[PDB]
Design a protein around this ligand. Structure first.
Ligand SMILES: [Zn+2]
Ligand SMILES: [Zn+2]
Lengths: 105, 69, 44
């Protein structure tokens, strides 16, 4: 996908901390290697269990947006692979568009 | 939407002829002109009313808020 | 019995300090039902 190619070609952004470690202490290399958008779903409050399915008719009637969750896994890399800390972080509801592959129609 | 009761130009009642026109088209292999002639629509003002009707009411009725889908 | 759910079309009613949601499903949109009331018109 274009999103995956974009995060792959973004590269890794690196920072240092002062903890005497030739340059400055340990190294942090934060990057993203997977961006995934899911079809819109409704939590129905806090019930959860099997998530409900939202539809554009519901979005239009509610006068809200029709958005699906956006997922990113951060490659928290310390000292160039010495210790990697993967973690999937949600980034709010990305407005998805109708009749697309990430839509319920 | 639903078939107009009266022809606009003159005033002839064509609201009782849409179902008859559809039956004449479906059951018998009648052309539109022959069906309109059999229905009794001689003027083209009356003929157009039933010949060019769309009947969007059937499409509108598929969205019923008072019955489970 | 003055409301209709917007997804399962089941008639219901609401009260004070009552959740605005269907009693048969989780939908939170309730169309108001049309009741019997005189509405004078003109055939013009
Ligand atoms: Zn006429
Ligand atoms: Zn319901």
């Amino acid at each position: 996908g274009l999103l995956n190619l974009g995060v792959k070609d973004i590269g890794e952004k690196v920072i240092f901390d002062g903890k005497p470690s030739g340059y400055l202490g340990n190294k942090l290399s934060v990057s993203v290697e997977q961006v995934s958008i899911a079809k819109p779903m409704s939590n129905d409050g806090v019930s959860s269990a099997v998530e409900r399915k939202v539809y554009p008719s519901e979005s239009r009637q509610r006068l809200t947006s029709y958005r699906g969750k956006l997922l990113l896994k951060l490659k928290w890399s310390v000292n160039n692979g010495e210790e990697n800390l993967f973690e999937v972080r949600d980034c709010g509801g990305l407005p998805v568009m109708l009749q697309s592959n990430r839509c319920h129609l | 939407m639903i078939v107009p009761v009266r022809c606009f130009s003159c005033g002839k009642v064509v609201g009782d002829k849409w179902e008859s026109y559809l039956n004449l088209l479906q059951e018998d292999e009648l052309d539109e002109g022959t069906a309109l002639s059999r229905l009794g629509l001689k003027r083209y003002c009356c003929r157009r009313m039933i010949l060019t009707h769309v009947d969007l009411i059937e499409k509108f009725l598929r969205y019923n808020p008072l019955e489970k889908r | 019995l003055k409301y209709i759910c917007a997804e399962c079309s089941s008639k219901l009613s609401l009260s004070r300090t009552d959740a605005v949601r269907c009693k048969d499903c989780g939908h939170r949109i309730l169309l108001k039902a049309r009741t019997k009331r005189l509405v004078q018109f003109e055939a013009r």
